[PDB]
């Protein structure tokens, strides 16, 4: 056909872990750098 399409790369990024010291607690929270949470 005669359509116009755009190509943008699949989302990627570096997951990093945020944590208080194990001397205090154990629960952590992750951060997905440069990611829209509609995908995650």
């Amino acid at each position: 056909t005669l359509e116009i399409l755009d190509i943008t790369p699949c989302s990627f990024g570096g997951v990093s872990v945020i944590t208080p010291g194990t001397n205090t607690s154990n629960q952590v929270a992750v951060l997905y750098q440069d990611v829209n949470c509609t995908e995650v």
């Binding site: 790369p9 990627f12 990024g13 570096g14 750098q33």
Partner: peptide, 23 residues
């Protein structure tokens, strides 16, 4: 700010910790 005028292959740019408002 007005005077100065200026991610596909595995390269990324991270935002600064301090925004321009804080500066």
């Amino acid at each position: 700010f007005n005077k100065v005028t200026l991610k596909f292959n595995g390269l990324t740019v991270l935002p600064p910790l301090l925004t321009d408002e804080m500066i």
